mmCIF file of C-alpha atoms and ligand atoms in Angstrom:
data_model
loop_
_atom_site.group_PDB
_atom_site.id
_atom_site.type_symbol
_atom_site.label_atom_id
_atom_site.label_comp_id
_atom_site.label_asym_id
_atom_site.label_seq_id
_atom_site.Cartn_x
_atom_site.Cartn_y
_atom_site.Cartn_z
ATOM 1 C CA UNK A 21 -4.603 8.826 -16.320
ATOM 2 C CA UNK A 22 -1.966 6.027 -15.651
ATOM 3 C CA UNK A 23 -2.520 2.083 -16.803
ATOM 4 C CA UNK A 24 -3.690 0.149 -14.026
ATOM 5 C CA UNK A 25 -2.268 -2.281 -12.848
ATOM 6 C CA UNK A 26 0.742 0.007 -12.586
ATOM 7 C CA UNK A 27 4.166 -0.685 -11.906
ATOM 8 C CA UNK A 28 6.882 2.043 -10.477
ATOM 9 C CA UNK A 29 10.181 0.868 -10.308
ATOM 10 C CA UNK A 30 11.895 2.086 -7.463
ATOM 11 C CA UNK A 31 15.834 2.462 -8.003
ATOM 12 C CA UNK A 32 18.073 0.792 -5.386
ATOM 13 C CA UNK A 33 15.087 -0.068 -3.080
ATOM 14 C CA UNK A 34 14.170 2.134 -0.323
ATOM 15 C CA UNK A 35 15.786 4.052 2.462
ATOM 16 C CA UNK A 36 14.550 5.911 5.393
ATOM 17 C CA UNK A 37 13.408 9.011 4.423
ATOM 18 C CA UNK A 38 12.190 8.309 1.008
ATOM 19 C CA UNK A 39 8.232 9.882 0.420
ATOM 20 C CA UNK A 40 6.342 7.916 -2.152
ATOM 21 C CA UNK A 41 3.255 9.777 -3.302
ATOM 22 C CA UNK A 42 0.067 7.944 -5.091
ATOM 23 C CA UNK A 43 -2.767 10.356 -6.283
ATOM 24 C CA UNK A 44 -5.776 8.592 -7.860
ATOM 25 C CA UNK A 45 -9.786 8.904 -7.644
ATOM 26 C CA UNK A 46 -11.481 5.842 -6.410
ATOM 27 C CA UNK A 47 -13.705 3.984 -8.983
ATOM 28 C CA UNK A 48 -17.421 4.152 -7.790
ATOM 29 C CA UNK A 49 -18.923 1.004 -6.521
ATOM 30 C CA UNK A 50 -14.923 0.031 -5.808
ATOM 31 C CA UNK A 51 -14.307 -3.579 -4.138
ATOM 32 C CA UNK A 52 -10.083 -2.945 -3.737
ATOM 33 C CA UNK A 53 -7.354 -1.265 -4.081
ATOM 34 C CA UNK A 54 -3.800 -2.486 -3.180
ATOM 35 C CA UNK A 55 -0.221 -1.219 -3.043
ATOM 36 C CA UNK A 56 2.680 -3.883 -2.957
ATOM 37 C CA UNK A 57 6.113 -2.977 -2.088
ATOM 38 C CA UNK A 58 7.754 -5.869 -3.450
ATOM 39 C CA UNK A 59 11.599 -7.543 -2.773
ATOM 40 C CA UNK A 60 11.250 -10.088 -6.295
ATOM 41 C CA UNK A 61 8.564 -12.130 -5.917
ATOM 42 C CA UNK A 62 8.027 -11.537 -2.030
ATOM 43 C CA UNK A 63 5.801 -8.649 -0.863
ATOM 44 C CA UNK A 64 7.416 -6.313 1.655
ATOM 45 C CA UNK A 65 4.556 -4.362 2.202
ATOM 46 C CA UNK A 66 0.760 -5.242 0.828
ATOM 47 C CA UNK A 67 -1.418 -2.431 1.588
ATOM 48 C CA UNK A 68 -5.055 -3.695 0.645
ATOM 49 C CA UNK A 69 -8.209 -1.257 1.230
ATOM 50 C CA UNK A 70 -11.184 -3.601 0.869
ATOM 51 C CA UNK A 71 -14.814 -1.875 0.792
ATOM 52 C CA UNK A 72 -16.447 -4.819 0.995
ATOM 53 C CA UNK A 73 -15.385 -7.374 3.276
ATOM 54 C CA UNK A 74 -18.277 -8.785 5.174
ATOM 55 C CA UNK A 75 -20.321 -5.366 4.099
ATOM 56 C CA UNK A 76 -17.385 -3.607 6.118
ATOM 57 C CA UNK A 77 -15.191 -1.489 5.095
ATOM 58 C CA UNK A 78 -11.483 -2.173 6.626
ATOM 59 C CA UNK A 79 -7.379 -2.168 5.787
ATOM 60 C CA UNK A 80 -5.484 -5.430 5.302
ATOM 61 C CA UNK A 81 -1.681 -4.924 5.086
ATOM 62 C CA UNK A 82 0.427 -7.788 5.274
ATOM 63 C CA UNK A 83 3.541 -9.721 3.678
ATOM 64 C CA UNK A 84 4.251 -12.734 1.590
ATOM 65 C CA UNK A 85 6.960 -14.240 1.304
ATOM 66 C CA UNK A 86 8.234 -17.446 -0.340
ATOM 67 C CA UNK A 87 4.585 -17.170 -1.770
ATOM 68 C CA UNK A 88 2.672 -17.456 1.059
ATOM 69 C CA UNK A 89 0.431 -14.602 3.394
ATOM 70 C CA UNK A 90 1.773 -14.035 6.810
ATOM 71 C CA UNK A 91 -0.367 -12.752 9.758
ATOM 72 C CA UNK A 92 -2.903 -9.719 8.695
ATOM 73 C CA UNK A 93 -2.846 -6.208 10.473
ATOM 74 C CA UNK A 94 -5.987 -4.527 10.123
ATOM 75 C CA UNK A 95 -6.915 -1.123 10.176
ATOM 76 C CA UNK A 96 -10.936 -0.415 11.017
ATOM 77 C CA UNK A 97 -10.000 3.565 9.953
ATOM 78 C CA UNK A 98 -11.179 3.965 6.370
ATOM 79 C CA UNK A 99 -10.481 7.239 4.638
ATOM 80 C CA UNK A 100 -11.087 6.270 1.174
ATOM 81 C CA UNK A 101 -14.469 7.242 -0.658
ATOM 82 C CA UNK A 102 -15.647 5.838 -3.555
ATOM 83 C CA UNK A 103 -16.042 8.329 -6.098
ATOM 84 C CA UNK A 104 -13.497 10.695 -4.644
ATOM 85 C CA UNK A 105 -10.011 11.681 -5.122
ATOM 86 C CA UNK A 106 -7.143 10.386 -2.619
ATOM 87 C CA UNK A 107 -3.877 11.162 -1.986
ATOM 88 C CA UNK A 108 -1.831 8.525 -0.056
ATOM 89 C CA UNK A 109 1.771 9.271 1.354
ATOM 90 C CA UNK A 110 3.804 6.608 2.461
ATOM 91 C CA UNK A 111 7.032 7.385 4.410
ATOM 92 C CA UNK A 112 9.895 4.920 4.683
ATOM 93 C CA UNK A 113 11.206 5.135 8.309
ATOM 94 C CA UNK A 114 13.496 3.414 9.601
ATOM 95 C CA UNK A 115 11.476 0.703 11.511
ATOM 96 C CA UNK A 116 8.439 1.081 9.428
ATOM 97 C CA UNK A 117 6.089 2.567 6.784
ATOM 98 C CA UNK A 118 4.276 5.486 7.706
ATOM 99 C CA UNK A 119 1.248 5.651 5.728
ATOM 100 C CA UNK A 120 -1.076 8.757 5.397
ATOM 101 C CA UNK A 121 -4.151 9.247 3.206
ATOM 102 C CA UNK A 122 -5.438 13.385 2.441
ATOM 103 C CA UNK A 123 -2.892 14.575 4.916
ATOM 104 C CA UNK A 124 -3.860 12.559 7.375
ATOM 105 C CA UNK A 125 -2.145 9.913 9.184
ATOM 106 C CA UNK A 126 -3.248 6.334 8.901
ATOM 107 C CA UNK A 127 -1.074 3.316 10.107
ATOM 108 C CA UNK A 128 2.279 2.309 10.637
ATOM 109 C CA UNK A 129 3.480 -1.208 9.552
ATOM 110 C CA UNK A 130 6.557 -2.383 10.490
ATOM 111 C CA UNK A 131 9.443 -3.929 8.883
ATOM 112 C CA UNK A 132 9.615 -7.515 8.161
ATOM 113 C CA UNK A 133 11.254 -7.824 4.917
ATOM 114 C CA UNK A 134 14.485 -6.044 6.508
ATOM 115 C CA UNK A 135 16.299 -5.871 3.417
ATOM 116 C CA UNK A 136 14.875 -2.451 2.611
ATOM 117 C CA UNK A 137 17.694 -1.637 -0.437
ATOM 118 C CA UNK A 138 16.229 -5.163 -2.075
ATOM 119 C CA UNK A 139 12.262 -3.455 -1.995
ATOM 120 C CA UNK A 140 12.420 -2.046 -5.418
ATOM 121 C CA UNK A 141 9.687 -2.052 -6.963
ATOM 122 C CA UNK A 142 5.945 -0.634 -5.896
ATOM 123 C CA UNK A 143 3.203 -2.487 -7.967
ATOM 124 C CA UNK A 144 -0.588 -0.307 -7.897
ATOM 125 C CA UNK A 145 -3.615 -2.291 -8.574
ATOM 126 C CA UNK A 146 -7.588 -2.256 -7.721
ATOM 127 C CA UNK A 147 -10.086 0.194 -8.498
ATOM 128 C CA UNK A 148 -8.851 3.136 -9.369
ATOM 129 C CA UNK A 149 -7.983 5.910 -11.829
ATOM 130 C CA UNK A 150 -4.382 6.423 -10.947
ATOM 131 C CA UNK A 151 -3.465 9.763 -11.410
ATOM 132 C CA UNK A 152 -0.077 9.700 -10.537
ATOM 133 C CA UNK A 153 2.998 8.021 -8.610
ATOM 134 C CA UNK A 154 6.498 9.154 -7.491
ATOM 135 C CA UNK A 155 9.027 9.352 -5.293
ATOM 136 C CA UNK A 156 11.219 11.644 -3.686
ATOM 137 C CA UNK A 157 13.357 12.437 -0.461
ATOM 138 C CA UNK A 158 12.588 14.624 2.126
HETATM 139 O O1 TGZ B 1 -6.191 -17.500 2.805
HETATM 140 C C1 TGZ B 1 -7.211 -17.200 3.766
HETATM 141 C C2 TGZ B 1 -7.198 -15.703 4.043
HETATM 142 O O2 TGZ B 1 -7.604 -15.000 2.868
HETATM 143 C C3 TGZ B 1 -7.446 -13.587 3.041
HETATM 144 S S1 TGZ B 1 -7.746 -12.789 1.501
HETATM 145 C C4 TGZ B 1 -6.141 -12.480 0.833
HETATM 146 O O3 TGZ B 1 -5.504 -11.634 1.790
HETATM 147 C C5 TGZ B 1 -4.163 -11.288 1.437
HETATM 148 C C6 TGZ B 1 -3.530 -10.483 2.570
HETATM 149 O O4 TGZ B 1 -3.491 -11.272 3.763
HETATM 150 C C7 TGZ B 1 -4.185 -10.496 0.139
HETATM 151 O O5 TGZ B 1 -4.931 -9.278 0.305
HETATM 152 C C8 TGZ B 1 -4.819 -11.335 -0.963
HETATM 153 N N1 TGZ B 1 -4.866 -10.530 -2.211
HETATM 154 C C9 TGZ B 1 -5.464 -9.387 -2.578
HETATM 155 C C10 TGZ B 1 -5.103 -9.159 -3.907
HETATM 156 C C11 TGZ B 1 -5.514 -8.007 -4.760
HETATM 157 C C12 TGZ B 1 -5.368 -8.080 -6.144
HETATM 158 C C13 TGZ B 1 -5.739 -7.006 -6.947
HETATM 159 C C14 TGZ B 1 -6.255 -5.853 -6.357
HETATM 160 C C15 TGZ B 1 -6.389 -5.783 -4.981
HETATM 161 F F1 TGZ B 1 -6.891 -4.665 -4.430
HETATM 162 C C16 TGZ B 1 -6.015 -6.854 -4.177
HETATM 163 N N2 TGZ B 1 -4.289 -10.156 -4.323
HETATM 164 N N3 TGZ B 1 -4.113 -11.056 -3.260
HETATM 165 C C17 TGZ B 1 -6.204 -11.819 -0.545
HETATM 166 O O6 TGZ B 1 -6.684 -12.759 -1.518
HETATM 167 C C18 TGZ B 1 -8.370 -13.089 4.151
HETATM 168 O O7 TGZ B 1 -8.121 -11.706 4.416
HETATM 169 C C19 TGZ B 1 -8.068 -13.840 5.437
HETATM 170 O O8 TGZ B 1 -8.971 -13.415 6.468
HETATM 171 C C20 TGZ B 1 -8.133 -15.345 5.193
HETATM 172 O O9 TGZ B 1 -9.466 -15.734 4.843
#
């Protein structure tokens, strides 16, 4: 497996069209897992499965910039399992990330860091065994 917290640099940002693939098992008894697009120190995209929130189980995305949170999007749909293997797919379009988890699709989150060329690296953290993480165009 891969270090975790894991970071994959991503060269000259990212572009509509690029496919970035994480494959990983979820730890059992997992609180988190996020994935952080980030532009420097500012967080394009913050995608933040939580299996414990209130004894809920839900998906926070959201951006920071300038070191602060901005509104939440939450997702209710929850297709990670602790215990069990994922594959998450996230497509850069060119109004926003697609995301899909095991084939299927999951949210869409649109742009607010605009600067999509200045997004270049993806940071992987939480509770998981990260399998693996690339990129590639399609
Ligand atoms: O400040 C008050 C608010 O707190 C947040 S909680 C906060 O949410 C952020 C996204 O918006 C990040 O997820 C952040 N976060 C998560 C992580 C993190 C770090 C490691 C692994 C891993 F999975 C996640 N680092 N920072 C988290 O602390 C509540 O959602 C909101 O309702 C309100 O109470």
């Amino acid at each position: 497996p891969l270090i975790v917290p894991y970071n994959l640099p991503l060269p000259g940002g990212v572009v509509p069209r690029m496919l970035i693939t994480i494959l990983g098992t979820v730890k059992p008894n997992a609180n988190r897992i996020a994935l952080d697009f980030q532009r420097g120190n500012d967080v394009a995209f913050h995608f933040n499965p939580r299996f414990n929130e209130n004894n809920r189980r839900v998906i926070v995305c959201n951006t920071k910039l300038d070191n602060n949170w901005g509104r939440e999007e939450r997702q209710s749909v929850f297709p990670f399992e602790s215990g069990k293997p994922f594959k998450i797919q996230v497509l850069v379009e060119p109004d926003h990330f697609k995301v899909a988890v095991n084939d299927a699709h999951l949210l869409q989150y649109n742009h607010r860091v605009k600067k999509l060329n200045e997004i270049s690296k993806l940071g992987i953290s939480g509770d998981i065994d990260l399998t693996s993480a690339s990129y590639t165009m399609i």
